Design a protein around this ligand. Structure first.
Ligand SMILES: *[C@@H]1O[C@H](CO)[C@@H](O[C@@H]2O[C@H](CO)[C@@H](O[C@@H]3O[C@H](CO[C@H]4O[C@H](CO[C@H]5O[C@H](CO)[C@@H](O)[C@H](O)[C@@H]5O)[C@@H](O)[C@H](O)[C@@H]4O)[C@@H](O)[C@H](O[C@H]4O[C@H](CO[C@H]5O[C@H](CO)[C@@H](O)[C@H](O)[C@@H]5O)[C@@H](O)[C@H](O)[C@@H]4O)[C@@H]3O)[C@H](O)[C@H]2NC(C)=O)[C@H](O)[C@H]1NC(C)=O
Ligand SMILES: *[C@@H]1O[C@H](CO[C@@H]2O[C@@H](C)[C@@H](O)[C@@H](O)[C@@H]2O)[C@@H](O[C@@H]2O[C@H](CO)[C@@H](O[C@@H]3O[C@H](CO[C@H]4O[C@H](CO)[C@@H](O)[C@H](O)[C@@H]4O)[C@@H](O)[C@H](O[C@H]4O[C@H](CO)[C@@H](O)[C@H](O)[C@@H]4O)[C@@H]3O)[C@H](O)[C@H]2NC(C)=O)[C@H](O)[C@H]1NC(C)=O
Ligand SMILES: *[C@@H]1O[C@H](CO)[C@@H](O[C@@H]2O[C@H](CO)[C@@H](O[C@@H]3O[C@H](CO[C@H]4O[C@H](CO)[C@@H](O)[C@H](O)[C@@H]4O)[C@@H](O)[C@H](O[C@H]4O[C@H](CO)[C@@H](O)[C@H](O)[C@@H]4O)[C@@H]3O)[C@H](O)[C@H]2NC(C)=O)[C@H](O)[C@H]1NC(C)=O
Ligand SMILES: *C[C@@](*)(O)[C@H](CCCNC(N)=[NH2+])NC(=O)CNC(=O)[C@@H](N)CCC(=O)O
Ligand SMILES: *[C@@H]1O[C@H](CO[C@@H]2O[C@@H](C)[C@@H](O)[C@@H](O)[C@@H]2O)[C@@H](O)[C@H](O)[C@H]1NC(C)=O
Ligand SMILES: [Ca+2]
Ligand SMILES: [Ca+2]
Ligand SMILES: [Cu+2]
Ligand code: NA
Lengths: 137, 234, 670, 651
């Protein structure tokens, strides 16, 4: 192969990567999107580790160049997310916005008068205009 | 306020100014609700009759922000004495409700445990008022602010020649010319947290003003939150 | 770059450890050993420089300065290979005087060993780094020894002090311009069995002299001395050098008992008190029966250069004449009035159970009981009479405060009360009292059973805790009739020598929210005066008791904290965000070092946060703890020994509940 | 005090077999057999770092950790940081983790006692076998260093189920809490000083869990020596020698003198030839630091003079017991090239896994020229598990404190290894790969942006090994490697006296004679500078005869340990000495021929093999003198000599 006028024709996924050892430049022009090509380039070199979904807790598995990464939800973190979390409002205030009250070890974000707990259970929302502790804007 | 910076427009809305019969500012205050103001106990003796002005960035001029409010009920701790300045706390319920507006906002009251275990272990508080710019000076008509770093209880009991009671905490510098001075008493000592300011202390007293070797002294609000909430039911 | 030349010749001598030269022209037996000692000679080895009556086995003291270079002349007069090797010098390979696998050529192996008769002059360049710092005393104290056979060679005695000094504090007379006296004591451990003579004997000596037979030392009253102490042993050792009736300064810390270990040395600025003669010792109980007790004579030299500093009127208001009224009653003290059932049963049946032959828990003891008046008819009601145990009443004082400790002796034997921060003068009370020459000289007049004396101490400017110490310094006070036999009876307390304006009008500290004493009095009732009284009055059959039994003798070392075994003491409680002041001081027959661990909490020790606090016997350390983390925590000794591991103290970092200020307010309209 | 880092750590108590004297017998070349125990290999459990939370891919111990021995991995966090350390009990016993001074809730204390606690977070108190947990640690201000004091502080974490027997079983490690801005964002390693965590501890095996107390029913009468045999007075759990203790000269070393020893582990830390400075508000100068059980003291000593000194407690018993590890202080300028750029290492000392064409390992000469001037491989073995390596043999245990790297081109294609890593060995069998302070298992050294430009990478701590393997991992169209390893001798006192850097004054060099150039220049003795560049930058003699010498006065009696000679280049010839001998005097008149120890005939040293080839020669015995003359014996077509003396002074 490798004809004189191969680069002039428009790119095709089969022509570049499936029928030949495509490099980064040749694959990008077929797709025109950097984000799309990066996903295809990561699996090309080291396969798709995310196919079996090694991580736990519905981790958003991400394929890279020789590594895997899953971003998991609250209560389960880490590369594997197979272990839970000590809530421990001592660090980063338990991801709250106001006071924590330690019941059995689940972080309990709280809000005082003129404030309301959020849907996610971490933020506080004032009940009315000009609540306590805020600069006038 | 020795040194520090002037309060900007809306920068210190929690600051309520007390004015005597002559409408001259002598002590500061903190807005707790639409009807209540937080001040210090020993400020009540300075005039024996006073009015509360809110939203004033300058005592000597009127700019459409001043609001002189009459006071309905004055409540102060009984155990408070001028010999020790202990239990230096007082709350003023006004005759008329406080109309929250620009440069007029109340201040929070955090939970007792969370304030002690997190707020009393932060880095720096905030203090403000209309005190003297220097010791034996003149109370500036403008509203100033000062960033008073917290000091550990053991560390700041050494410098003070008078006992620091459990209801008192120190903030300031053992060397620097930064401390609130005469005319700042009853001013807030608030604590910042995620852009939300919580009341931590009330300006109780201080040996001198910003003396090398000294910090300002404040009365721990968290020791009287049940007292404050009960008094706020007046 | 001044250069100096000392002369040391390793001439072993036929040495009796008791003073052989100090004899009244009589043989005084032999009991001698073939030591190997350094000696100082006249230059170019023409003759010897005669040594002092006390230096004994110590070699010629060395003295250099920053920049000044030493050249020590050495040539062995013994039959062994020996070298000279000083601590704290940046010496080179050609003069190191140490033999190990340094990969060095035989030319540089010459310093490693000197063949008998061979000569080598070791040069020791002294740069700025080795010299004392701006915060250090003038003459840093080191120690030199032969590094051929580090165990056997030293036990022969090849030991001598090295004193590197500051740039401009030395004359050519072997002393300092700024100091009116200078002494070099030695607390070394000599094991004859390991010595080259290989004779079965172990020798704890002062300046190479055994059992306190060294000649006394003469100084002047109010003399600005610069003492130098040496500690040296081949087995691990704990020296606690103390100068009775005196107060030192170890690197600007106003210590009273200065503590060292094997192969260590120290320097202390020291201003003497009045004319007198005390008995120096090393308080560590191993060294106490071993007799490391030197002596000192304070001569009244007519020097009036300085006797007062600045005393003003404004400080006379603060000179509050505190009036403590302490007694000493002989009663039964129980380390376990109440015992939890969860505690270890097996240990309860040995050291606690009242066996038919083992007493166990209840013992006869004497204790320091405070009072309020001269009549001693009412004990002072402290809140922690059960919390602090048998610890003596805290004697709080400030600088210039003229205390009046009215000690009382209701006990059954003579005792005393010796502070650790008062240079107390023995020539203050005798006016027209007849003294007998040479019969059981107790340091304080023997307070017979039922006698009372009025001590009048004084916190002079020499006992002020410096800028680097806690406001109140813990310095134990004990009956100085016999430090062994007495602290075992519990006559231990703490003397809070606070700074100026550190106490309120009542007499309580002004910077600690709660004051807490934690003293690890490792008792030994067999070393108490009531060992016979402990057994006979509680034992059912006193005809079958044997002091030799480890099942009885070791069944009496009652390791405690503040007077109670930690398995039989209450759990502490201190409110959140307080500053509890901790008063730590080891006592008793604890021959080892007791390191304690604060679980989850830390304290402040010398402008520095520490979690483990090492403790030497009869040395006090004061730290303040900020209760700053909710939970229930523990104080434990990390030492592996079962006696030293059962010391486990439990305390809770509770959250302070009301605080009932809610039900007390007044309502008034303007 | 909240915008910090959540320090993530994963510590697993894995099972290994630990032999304390495993580094005493590696240097057994002596007729002594009375200062070592027999059968010193034991079974234990040790905290070991793991890179991943799954505890599969372990984190190997590099060289910064080479001195740790039985200690656990170093845990570090600045003030106000949050530490998450995950325990993975890989032993057959329930362990935990304790901590000192750190801020930790009762869910991370790790110590079980009668605290009356609800059990929903007691799962820290005693982690059961095969299980896992996570200890959350906060480093508040009550755990950091002083202000102002030393830059870091030392704490000791260990299993806290029964520490008095769990530390004798090998479960212990350093926990360093530093000031803000000192540790690294990713590596979690300090950046300012050199830290030596030393554990002066007695490992009494008669108390460990894995104490194989087999039946001693049939045994002779006690010899009073086996009782103390199982006790190992060791520094970091290695008796009589401990690797890794390598520090420069006149350099500040932050010694974290940890100790969790018992009630009788009194250890007087003493450095031979060094003085210890207790940094803090009051800086104190010490020679020995009397260390105490339970202490973690962070001192700062200043190195005095290079050589094999002796770290040791000064307690006599613990000297011949084994708690005396020779630490290695190196020369201040231990940047000396090891001979690849000069010619000290010949082509017969260079091997490789592979090579491309004429790019043999013989081309590893630094700054080499010509068509083929480097060690190149056509295709990097990235696909394979064994990447190509190049090896050099030092023929002796030396120190390598750094490395240089380059590349080459085929007249158009700049080819260079944009990355590589170094593996070192002494016996060419037991191989270890350099890790340094990298986050990964191996420090994949940064390569060169261009082939010619240098990229100096410093092996910190320095490598003490005879064989060096360099395995590039990345390339730019081809790997192409040139290198000159840099370091000094294991035996100190090898710093150049100053013939090159100008430290030795020009007037100090005096000649027997010298020549004249074709225009008027002279080969004066002061122009004997090493590696000197120029038409006339060498020392010569007017007459070619044995009676010539080069006298250089040291102005102080120096201890010369070696010598390196060179040759010069003429307009159309190479000028250099073929053989010589050295002469010396303590006063400058009584010149002595340099003989052997058992020979009465002067040792005629082998002169310059060629012009630039550094003909290094050693002095056994050395030259303890202030004056020195190098008397030539044979020279090629003329005489020239630009030598250099590698020694130290007398103090
Ligand atoms: C000054 O005058 C005073 C009296 O006024 C004299 O005081 C005496 O000082 C002696 C030292 O000079 C003490 O010696 C004791 O000797 C025994 C040690 O020798 C025995 O063991 C040897 C092997 O031991 C090895 O280690 C020891 C460690 O000390 C070394 O000393 C020794 O060289 C060896 O290396 C054998 O070779 C020898 O034959 C002996 O059998 C010991 O008795 C003692 O120390 C030990 O004992 C005491 C008490 O034991 C009890 O408690 C321990 C707790 O650990 C427990 O294990 C035991 O079972 C017992 O219950 C412990 O406190 C020690 O820690 C040791 O275990 C001494 O070393 C004399 O005791 C002392 N006499 C008195 C009455 O106090 C002195 O001679 C004069 N001169 C000086 C001091 O220079
Ligand atoms: C060695 O230790 C000294 C302290 O410890 C000594 O021994 C212990 C055991 C105690 O007995 C203790 O009382 C002993 O002094 C240590 O400092 C010494 O401290 C004393 C007491 O404060 C000083 O005495 C007075 O000091 C000043 C002069 O000092 C100046 O310099 C020092 C720097 O060290 C500064 O701290 C001071 O502020 C001063 O600037 C004088 O006030 C006074 O002399 C006279 O002054 C006027 C008349 O001129 C009048 O008030 C009186 O007549 C005074 O008598 C005293 O001298 C003492 O000076 C000081 N020692 C020295 C050498 O300066 C000492 O520093 C330690 N050594 C080292 C090297 O650190
Ligand atoms: C693994 O180890 C390697 C070495 O093998 C480390 O290499 C470091 O490389 C980085 C750059 O990538 C260097 O970092 C910077 O170096 C400079 C050093 O200057 C300091 O020192 C001089 C000398 O006295 C002082 O005069 C000066 O004031 C500085 O203190 C500076 O540019 C930077 O310093 C910054 O931090 C310090 C410390 O807070 C501050 O004082 C400075 O103001 C400034 O903010 C910076 O340090 C570094 O020098 C190289 N190391 C060495 C030993 O040379 C790798 O970083 C390391 N990798 C890891 C740990 O992941
Ligand atoms: C009442 C109130 O206005 C003042 C202000 C004190 C503020 N202090 C500090 N450190 N910021 N409180 C005083 O008037 C209370 N009394 C005192 O401070 C006196 N002990 C000294 C008065 C003085 O020195 O002017
Ligand atoms: C823990 O494990 C022991 C054997 O280990 C097994 O294999 C290794 C490789 C690991 O995967 C480990 O988890 C496996 O169990 C068992 O004998 C032991 O009983 C286990 N312990 C407990 C308490 O269940
Ligand atoms: Ca106004
Ligand atoms: Ca040697
Ligand atoms: Cu040593
Ligand atoms: Na100040």
């Amino acid at each position: 192969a490798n004809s004189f006028l191969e680069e002039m024709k428009k790119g095709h996924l089969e022509r570049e990567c499936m029928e030949e050892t495509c490099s980064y430049e040749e694959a990008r022009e077929v797709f025109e999107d950097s984000d799309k090509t990066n996903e295809f380039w990561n699996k090309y070199k080291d396969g798709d580790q995310c196919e079996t979904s090694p991580c736990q807790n519905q981790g958003k598995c991400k394929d890279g160049l020789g590594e895997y990464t899953c971003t998991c939800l609250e209560g389960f973190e880490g590369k594997n997310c197979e272990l839970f979390t000590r809530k421990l409002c001592r660090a980063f205030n338990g991801d709250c916005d106001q006071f924590c009250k330690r019941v059995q070890s689940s972080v309990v974000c709280s809000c005082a008068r003129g404030y309301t707990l959020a849907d996610n259970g971490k933020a506080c929302i004032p009940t009315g205009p000009y609540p306590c502790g805020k600069q006038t804007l | 306020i020795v040194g520090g910076q002037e309060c900007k427009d809306g920068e210190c809305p929690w600051q309520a100014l007390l004015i005597n019969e002559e409408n001259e500012g002598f002590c500061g205050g903190t807005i707790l609700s639409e009807f209540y103001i937080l001040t210090a106990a020993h400020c009540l003796y300075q005039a024996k009759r006073f009015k509360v002005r809110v939203g004033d960035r300058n005592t000597e001029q009127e700019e459409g922000g001043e609001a002189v409010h009459e006071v309905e009920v004055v409540i102060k701790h009984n155990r408070f004495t001028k010999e020790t300045y202990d239990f230096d706390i007082a709350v003023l319920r006004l005759k008329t409700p406080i109309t929250f507006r620009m440069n007029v906002a109340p201040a929070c009251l955090p939970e007792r445990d969370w304030a002690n275990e997190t707020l009393m272990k932060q880095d720096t508080g905030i203090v403000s008022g209309f005190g003297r710019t220097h010791e034996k000076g003149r109370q500036s008509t403008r509203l100033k602010m000062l960033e008073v770093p917290y000091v550990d209880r053991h560390s700041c009991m050494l410098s003070s020649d008078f006992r620091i009671t459990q209801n008192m905490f120190c903030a300031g510098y053992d060397t620097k010319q930064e401390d609130a001075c005469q005319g700042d008493s009853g001013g807030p000592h608030v604590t910042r947290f995620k852009d939300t300011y919580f009341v931590t202390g009330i300006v109780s007293w201080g040996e001198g003003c910003a003396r090398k070797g000294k910090y300002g002294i404040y009365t721990k609000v968290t020791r009287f939150l049940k007292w404050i909430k009960r008094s706020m039911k007046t | 770059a001044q250069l100096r030349q000392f002369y040391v010749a390793a001439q072993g001598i036929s040495w009796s450890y008791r003073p052989e030269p100090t004899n009244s022209s009589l043989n005084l037996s032999v009991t001698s050993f073939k030591k190997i000692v350094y000696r100082e000679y006249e230059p170019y080895f023409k003759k010897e420089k005669p040594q002092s009556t006390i230096s004994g086995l110590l070699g010629p003291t060395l003295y250099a300065e920053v920049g000044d270079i030493i050249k020590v002349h050495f040539k062995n007069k013994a039959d062994k290979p020996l070298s000279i090797h000083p601590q704290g010098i940046r010496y080179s390979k050609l003069s190191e005087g140490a033999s190990y696998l340094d990969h060095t050529f035989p030319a540089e192996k010459m310093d490693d060993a000197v063949a008998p008769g061979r000569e080598y002059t070791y040069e020791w360049s002294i740069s700025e780094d080795s010299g004392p710092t701006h915060d250090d005393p003038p003459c840093l104290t080191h120690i030199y020894y032969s590094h051929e056979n580090l165990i056997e060679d030293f036990n022969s005695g090849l030991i001598g002090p090295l004193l590197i000094c500051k740039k401009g504090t030395l004359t050519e007379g072997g002393t300092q311009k700024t100091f009116d006296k200078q002494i070099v004591l030695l607390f070394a451990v000599f094991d004859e069995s390991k010595s080259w003579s290989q004779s079965s004997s172990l020798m704890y000596t002062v300046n190479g002299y055994v059992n306190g037979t060294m000649p006394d030392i003469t100084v002047c009253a109010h003399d600005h001395i610069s003492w130098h102490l040496l500690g040296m042993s081949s087995g691990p050792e704990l020296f606690s050098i103390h100068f009775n009736g005196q107060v030192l300064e170890q690197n600007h810390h106003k210590v009273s008992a200065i503590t060292l270990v094997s192969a260590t040395s120290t320097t202390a600025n020291m201003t003497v008190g009045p004319e007198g003669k005390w008995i120096i010792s090393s308080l560590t109980p191993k060294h106490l029966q071993a007799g490391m007790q030197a002596y000192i004579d304070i001569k009244n030299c007519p020097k009036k250069t300085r006797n007062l500093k600045k005393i003003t009127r404004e400080q006379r208001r603060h000179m509050k004449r505190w009036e403590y009224f302490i007694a000493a009653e002989e009663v039964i003290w129980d380390y376990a009035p109440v015992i939890p059932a969860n505690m270890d049963k097996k240990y309860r049946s040995q050291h606690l159970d009242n066996f038919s032959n083992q007493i166990g828990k209840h013992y006869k003891k004497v204790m320091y009981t405070q009072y309020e008046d001269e009549s001693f008819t009412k004990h002072t009601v402290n809140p922690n009479m059960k919390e602090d145990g048998i610890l003596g009443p805290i004697i709080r004082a400030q600088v210039r405060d003229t205390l009046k400790i009215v000690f009382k002796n209701m006990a059954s034997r003579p005792y005393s009360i010796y502070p650790h921060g008062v240079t107390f003068s023995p020539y203050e009370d005798e006016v027209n009292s007849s003294f007998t020459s040479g019969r059981n000289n107790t340091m304080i007049r023997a307070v017979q059973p039922g006698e009372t004396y009025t001590y009048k101490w004084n916190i002079l400017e020499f006992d002020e805790p410096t800028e680097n110490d806690a406001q109140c310094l813990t310095r134990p006070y004990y009956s100085d009739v016999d430090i062994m036999r007495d602290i075992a009876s519990g006559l231990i307390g703490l003397l809070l020598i606070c700074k100026s304006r550190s106490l309120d009008r009542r007499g309580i500290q002004r910077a600690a929210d709660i004051e807490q004493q934690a003293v690890f009095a490792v008792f030994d009732e067999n070393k108490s005066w009531y060992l016979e009284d402990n057994i006979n009055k509680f034992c059912e059959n006193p005809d079958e008791v044997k002091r030799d039994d480890p099942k009885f003798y070791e069944s009496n070392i009652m390791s405690t904290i503040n007077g109670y075994v930690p398995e039989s003491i209450t759990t502490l409680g201190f409110c959140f965000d307080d500053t509890v002041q901790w008063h730590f001081c080891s006592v008793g027959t604890q021959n080892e070092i007791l390191t304690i661990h604060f679980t989850g909490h830390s304290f402040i020790y010398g402008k520095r946060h520490e979690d483990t606090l090492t403790l030497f016997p009869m040395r006090g350390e004061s730290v303040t703890v900020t209760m700053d983390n909710v939970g229930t925590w523990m104080l434990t000794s990390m030492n592996s020994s079962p006696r030293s591991k059962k010391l486990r103290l439990k305390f809770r970092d509770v959250k302070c509940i009301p605080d009932d200020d809610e039900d007390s307010y007044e309502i008034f309209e303007p | 005090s909240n915008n910090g880092n959540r320090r993530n750590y994963y510590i697993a108590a894995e099972e290994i077999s630990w032999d304390y004297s495993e580094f005493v017998q590696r240097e057994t070349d002596i007729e002594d057999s009375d200062d070592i125990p027999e059968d010193t290999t034991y079974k234990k459990v040790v905290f070991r770092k793991y890179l991943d939370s799954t505890f599969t891919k372990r984190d190997p111990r590099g060289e910064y950790e080479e001195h740790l021995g039985i200690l656990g991995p170093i845990i570090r966090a600045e003030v106000d940081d949050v530490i998450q350390v995950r325990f993975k009990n890989l032993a057959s016993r329930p362990y935990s983790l304790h901590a000192h001074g750190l801020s930790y809730e009762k869910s991370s204390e790790g110590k079980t006692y009668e605290d009356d606690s609800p059990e929903w977070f007691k799962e820290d108190n005693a982690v059961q076998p095969n299980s896992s947990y996570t200890y959350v640690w906060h480093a508040t201000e009550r755990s950091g260093p002083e202000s102002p004091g030393s830059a870091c502080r030392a704490w000791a974490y260990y299993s806290a189920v029964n520490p008095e027997k769990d530390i004798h079983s090998g479960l212990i490690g350093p926990l360093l809490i530093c000031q803000k801005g000192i540790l690294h964002k990713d590596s979690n390693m300090p950046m300012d000083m050199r830290e030596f965590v030393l554990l002066f501890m007695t490992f009494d095996e008669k108390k460990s869990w894995y104490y194989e107390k087999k039946s001693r029913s049939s045994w002779r009468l006690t010899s009073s020596e086996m009782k103390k045999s199982h006790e190992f007075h060791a520094i970091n759990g290695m008796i009589y020698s401990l690797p890794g203790l390598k520090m420069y000269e006149q350099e500040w070393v932050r010694l974290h003198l940890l100790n969790i020893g018992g009630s009788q582990d009194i250890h007087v830390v003493h450095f031979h030839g060094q003085t210890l400075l207790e940094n803090g508000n009051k800086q104190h100068q010490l020679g020995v630091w009397p260390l105490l059980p339970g202490s973690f003291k962070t001192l700062e000593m200043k190195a005095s003079k290079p050589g094999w000194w002796l770290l040791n407690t000064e307690v006599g018993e613990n000297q011949r017991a084994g708690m005396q590890t020779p630490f290695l202080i190196m020369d201040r300028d231990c940047r000396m090239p090891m001979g690849l750029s000069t010619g000290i290492i010949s082509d017969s000392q260079i091997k490789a896994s592979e090579f491309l064409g004429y790019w043999e390992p013989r081309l590893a000469r630094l700054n080499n020229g010509g068509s083929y001037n480097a060690w190149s491989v056509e295709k990097l073995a990235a696909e394979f598990a064994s990447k190509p390596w190049i090896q050099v043999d030092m023929q002796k245990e030396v120190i390598i404190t750094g490395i240089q790297t380059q590349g080459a081109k085929h007249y158009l294609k700049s080819c260079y290894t944009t990355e590589f890593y170094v593996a070192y060995s002494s016996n060419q069998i037991n191989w270890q790969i350099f890790k340094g302070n990298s986050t990964r298992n191996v420090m994949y050294f940064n390569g060169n942006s261009d082939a010619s430009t240098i990229k100096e990478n410093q092996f910190d701590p320095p490598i003490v090994a005879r064989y060096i393997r360099i395995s590039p991992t990345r390339a730019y169209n081809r790997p192409t490697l040139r290198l000159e390893l840099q370091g000094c001798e294991v035996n100190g006192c090898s710093t150049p006296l100053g013939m090159e850097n100008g430290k030795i004054e020009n007037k100090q060099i005096t000649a027997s004679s010298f020549k004249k150039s074709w225009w008027g220049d002279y080969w004066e003795p002061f122009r004997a500078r090493l590696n000197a560049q120029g038409r006339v930058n060498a020392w010569q003699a007017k007459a070619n005869n044995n009676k010539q010498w080069l006298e250089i006065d040291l102005l102080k009696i120096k201890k010369i340990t070696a010598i390196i000679t060179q040759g010069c280049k003429s307009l159309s010839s190479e000028m250099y000495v073929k053989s010589y001998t050295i002469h010396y005097s303590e006063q400058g008149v009584e010149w002595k021929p340099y003989r052997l120890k058992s020979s009465m005939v002067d040792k005629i040293f082998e002169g310059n093999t060629n012009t630039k080839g550094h003909v290094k020669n050693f002095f056994n015995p050395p030259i303890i003198s202030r004056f020195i003359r190098v008397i030539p014996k044979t020279w090629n077509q003329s005489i020239a000599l630009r030598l250099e003396l590698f020694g130290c002074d007398i103090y």
